[PDB]
Design a protein around this ligand. Structure first.
Ligand code: MG
Ligand code: MG
Ligand code: MG
Ligand code: MG
Ligand code: MG
Ligand code: MG
Ligand code: MG
Ligand code: MG
Ligand code: MG
Ligand code: MG
Ligand code: MG
Ligand code: MG
Ligand code: MG
Ligand code: MG
Ligand code: MG
Ligand code: MG
Ligand code: MG
Ligand code: MG
Ligand code: MG
Ligand code: ZN
Lengths: 25, 214, 127, 63, 97
RNA sequence: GGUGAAAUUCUUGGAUUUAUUGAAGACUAACUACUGCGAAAGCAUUUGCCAAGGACGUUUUCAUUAAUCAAGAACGAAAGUUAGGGGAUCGAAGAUGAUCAGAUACCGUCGUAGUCUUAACCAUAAACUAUGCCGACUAGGGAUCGGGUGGUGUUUUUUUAAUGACCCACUCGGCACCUUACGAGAAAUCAAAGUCUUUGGGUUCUGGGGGGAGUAUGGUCGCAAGGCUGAAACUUAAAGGAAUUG
RNA sequence: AUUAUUGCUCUUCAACGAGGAAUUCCUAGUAAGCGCAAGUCAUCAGCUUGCGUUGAUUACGUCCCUGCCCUUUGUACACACC
């Protein structure tokens, strides 16, 4: 996939793990 | 079941003084009925005729003129100065590559107190033995020419109204005084007052207006 | 010699405007466009139409009072194509060849000291 | 009807997308010393005589 | 790899020029990289000039052409106008005709 | 009106076209170039002010004061964020007319944020010459931008000059092109990418097969979005570059 | 020999009044018209392969349509755009 959109893929992907981790702080 | 033509009042346009043909053209109004008359309604229109279409000669192909209608009298309406334009084609021709353009302007008053803004354009010429294919001034050159142009333009106005200013613009006296003071600085070709607009007329004064007529 | 008025032929694509008015402009005299004298949208600017409309416009122009007329041909302008449309030349041709005089004509296509962002976005109208 | 006679003086070539059309310069006989190029419909060689139905008007290219 | 030394088009010692809008599709494109033609042409045309002077006043008149500079976007330049495509070498030739 | 063609749309409210005026915000057309300047981002209307700069000129001054740089700092396109203002235009989102088997799009319409500006953030771009800086050396050519020097050069007339613009030779320092190639390179190409197994002028920084991955983690910066720093397990025989013929 | 091999005679006497959008073939002893021999074949040519007979109109050009070649140019394809 376009590198630009793979970067976006994982931008989001991190935002969710950033989110799910917070539930547990 | 109308056709406003089988109704429209008709009219011819007369020009001011310091040119050639005072007769100019025709127009349509509406019959001066009680409530909404042909008179006070419009008249105040304006007309654009090339002055070569109004001076006869062709050493004036460009240079357009705005005439505004101020007064009316029995199928005869005069007109006065309202501006001066250039033709689109002439400029587009004057403005060629490989050379520097120069423009400058000023707002200023006249005797009979019409205020106006006159324009001025000039391009750098190669001079007849040059080798380099372009010819550019030196910015420091450009700033000089403008200031002098401006010095000259302000002087030429507030002579006896647009009246004398019109009488001044027609034979392009301005053009060559520019040409004069300038050649101490840089070459230059074309050089014209290009434009001039009106923005602050005084008061009607039915007297003074009537001085161009006879 | 004649009686004079203004022609002003706006010629964009998809339509061509012809309408003569008083040399002051304030007062019209007969119009009609290219979209009038044929019906197909697609052909709304074609030279064949603007002819037939330059024909119907010449007619009235002389059937009212104007014996002659100067022209001011014009394109879309502004932040648009700025180039002459198709049925401008056909219009001019049709109104001189009609039975009307011609005198000193210039271009009046609005040209900006550029700006107001063009339409269709940075990547262009793409198809 | 003003008939107008012209003698083909040179064969220039084939215009028309199709190409059935030949470009030709002619010399009209009744008072020479002038020339005009015409477009033909049929096969043509040098020294042929074309009846220009209207003397003064000529074309160039064809599509 | 690389394909031109002028890269895209004409820009050495500057770093930023400023975009124009394509006359055909309106695509932005740096002015130096543009591709341009003065669209100098007559107001009338081929045939009209006779029928022009014929039904006009004045002697032969004067005749004043139109002048407008054209800005194309490469693709638009390539799709119709000046372009073709040249050999590896003919590319190098900057001469117009 | 708009299109390849259409439709959504606007039209007794005289639309679209015309004319005269006015207001709002944005922008700087043409002149504009293998042309200028800036550390880089970047910078094209005028005029006044404010300080700044390179190059040149120099038989002025000081005299090793310099080169390059972990840390640290200044600035930093666009978007994006906070708080005002502004909000013309174009216009992420959204809603539509069509197209399509589908059509969350391309094309058309409506148009929110935005686009502009102030105060503060953010610090990233293929931020590109994909090419560190200082110094020396190595090879031809015609242009050009700035500075200077030389001339019983041209053109400007007045009374010769003085000027200014122009012409020719030279010389510094700019932006580039040309041809060559002693030389270099895997080549494409390169006056540097040259002066390297005949391997050393000074200095900074980064890379060490591919994926995993700019991921996990910790630290840190941020309002946020995210920036900086930044692994391993595992997987894998190629991935990659330039040129050739198809 | 019926589902009628072919041939003859009488009778029966259809559609078809030059053919929409489309589309084939052709430049001289050619097109078209005309019949013959040969192949097949016990018997059956509305087919074919050749043959001679009568014998034109119109081009002797072009790139518009369609088809294919050739350069140039892109390619991450080379089992090569299936
Ligand atoms: Mg919880
Ligand atoms: Mg395309
Ligand atoms: Mg490539
Ligand atoms: Mg940049
Ligand atoms: Mg400007
Ligand atoms: Mg520390
Ligand atoms: Mg650092
Ligand atoms: Mg807005
Ligand atoms: Mg949508
Ligand atoms: Mg839909
Ligand atoms: Mg969507
Ligand atoms: Mg980076
Ligand atoms: Mg680049
Ligand atoms: Mg050199
Ligand atoms: Mg294997
Ligand atoms: Mg390759
Ligand atoms: Mg047989
Ligand atoms: Mg058979
Ligand atoms: Mg290849
Ligand atoms: Zn384009």
């Amino acid at each position: 996939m376009r590198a630009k959109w793979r970067k976006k893929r994982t931008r989001r992907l991190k935002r969710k793990r950033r989110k799910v981790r917070a539930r547990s702080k | 079941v109308v056709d406003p033509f089988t109704r429209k009042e008709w009219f011819d346009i007369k020009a001011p003084s310091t040119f050639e043909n005072r007769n100019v053209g025709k127009t349509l109004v509406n019959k001066s009925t009680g409530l909404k008359s042909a008179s006070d309604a419009l008249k105040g229109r304006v007309v654009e005729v090339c002055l070569a279409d109004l001076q006869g000669s062709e050493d004036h192909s460009f240079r357009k003129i705005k005439l505004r209608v101020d007064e009316v009298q029995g199928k005869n309406l005069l007109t006065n100065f309202h501006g001066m334009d250039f033709t689109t084609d002439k400029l587009r021709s004057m403005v060629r590559k490989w050379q520097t353009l120069i423009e400058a302007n000023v707002t200023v008053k006249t005797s009979d107190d019409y205020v106006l803004r006159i324009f001025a354009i000039a391009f750098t010429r190669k001079q007849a033995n040059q080798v380099k294919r372009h010819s550019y001034a030196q910015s420091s050159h450009i700033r000089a020419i403008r200031k002098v142009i401006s010095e000259i333009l302000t002087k030429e106005v507030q002579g006896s109204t647009l009246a004398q200013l019109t009488s001044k613009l027609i034979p392009e006296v301005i053009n060559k005084e520019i040409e004069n003071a300038t050649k101490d600085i840089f070459p230059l070709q074309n050089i014209h007052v290009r434009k001039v607009k009106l923005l602050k007329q005084p008061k009607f004064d039915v007297g003074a207006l009537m001085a161009l007529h006879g | 010699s004649q009686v004079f008025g203004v022609a002003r032929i706006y010629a964009s694509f998809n339509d061509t405007f012809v309408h003569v008015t008083d040399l002051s402009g304030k007062e019209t005299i007969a119009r009609v466009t290219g979209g009038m004298k044929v019906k197909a949208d697609r052909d709304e600017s074609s030279p064949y139409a603007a002819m037939l409309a330059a024909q119907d416009v010449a007619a009235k122009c002389k059937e009212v009072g104007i014996t002659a007329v100067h022209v001011k041909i014009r394109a879309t302008g502004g932040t648009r194509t700025k180039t002459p449309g198709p049925g401008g030349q056909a219009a001019l041709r049709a109104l001189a060849r009609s039975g009307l005089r011609i005198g000193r004509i210039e271009d009046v296509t609005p040209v900006p000291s550029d700006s107001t962002r063009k339409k269709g976005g940075r990547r262009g109208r793409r198809l | 009807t003003p008939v107008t006679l012209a003698k083909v003086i040179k064969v220039l070539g084939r215009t028309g997308s199709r190409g059935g059309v030949t470009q030709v310069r002619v010399e009209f006989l009744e008072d020479t010393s002038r020339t005009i190029v015409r477009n033909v419909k049929g096969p043509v060689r040098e020294n042929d005589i074309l009846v220009l139905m209207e003397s003064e008007r000529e074309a160039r290219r064809l599509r | 790899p690389k394909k031109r030394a002028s890269n895209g088009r004409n820009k050495k010692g500057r770093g930023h020029v400023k975009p124009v809008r394509c006359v055909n599709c309106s695509k932005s494109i740096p002015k130096d990289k543009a591709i341009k033609r003065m669209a100098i042409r007559n107001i009338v045309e081929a045939a009209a000039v006779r029928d022009l002077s014929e039904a006009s006043v004045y002697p032969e008149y004067a005749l004043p052409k139109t002048y407008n500079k054209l800005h194309y976007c490469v693709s638009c330049a390539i799709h119709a106008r000046i372009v073709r495509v040249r050999s590896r070498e003919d590319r190098k030739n900057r001469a117009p005709p």
